[PDB]
Amino acid sequence: MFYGTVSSPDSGVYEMKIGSIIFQVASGDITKEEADVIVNSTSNSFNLKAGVSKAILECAGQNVERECSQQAQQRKNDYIITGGGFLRCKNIIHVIGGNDVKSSVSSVLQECEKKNYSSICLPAIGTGNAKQHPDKVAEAIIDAIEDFVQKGSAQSVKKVKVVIFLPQVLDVFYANMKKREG
Ligand SMILES: COCC(=O)Nc1ccc(O)cc1
Ligand SMILES: [Cl-]
Ligand SMILES: [Cl-]
């Protein structure tokens, strides 16, 4: 009821519509992206600095690191929202890589609608330090977007892009998009 056709609008970028949302995947360095929200995949202490999290916390800067540890010591959080620091975004949403990936992506979408944001960029959440399997992660990310659209929740959100560190993981995402296409 929701999926469009898979195509390539730019070299190495693959896209398809899911309802009103353009869903894109590409390999590369997420810290060079511009979007309303960039997602970080981190530990339950919000202070991992290994893999994608290292790149994100180093580029964002020390004020963002301090925002993370301050919120961490205030309550038990499933995720936290900070400033963008020196990343090209309005906010970073830091999710726990070991948590249910569908749940994490649902929360990111909801928070973006609350702020009337249009664009999101995320990594292949949980495939690094958390060692979740790449096709289970791809299935969960795309399932969350489908559910959000099915419920009529997409209003401000128009683009969701996964920027993936390993080309081998990109290949898994592309196969999952082809499975779903109209
Ligand atoms: C979240 O799990 C994937 C991950 O850590 N990816 C990753 C990103 C950048 C980098 O420089 C090394 C690795
Ligand atoms: Cl992770
Ligand atoms: Cl990644």
UniProtKB/Swiss-Prot annotation:
Record's subcellular location: Nucleus; Cytoplasm
PTM statement from Swiss-Prot or TrEMBL: Auto-ADP-ribosylated.
Record-annotated Macro domain positions: 10-181
Tissue expression: Expressed in macrophages.
Swiss-Prot/TrEMBL induction comment: Up-regulated by IFNG in macrophages. Down-regulated by IL4 in macrophages.
Function: ADP-ribosyltransferase that mediates mono-ADP-ribosylation of glutamate residues on target proteins. In contrast to PARP1 and PARP2, it is not able to mediate poly-ADP-ribosylation. Has been shown to catalyze the mono-ADP-ribosylation of STAT1 at 'Glu-657' and 'Glu-705', thus decreasing STAT1 phosphorylation which negatively regulates pro-inflammatory cytokine production in macrophages in response to IFNG stimulation.
Family: Belongs to the ARTD/PARP family.
Listed name of the protein: Protein mono-ADP-ribosyltransferase PARP14
Provenance organism: Homo sapiens (Human)
Whole sequence portion shown: 1208 to 1388 of 1801
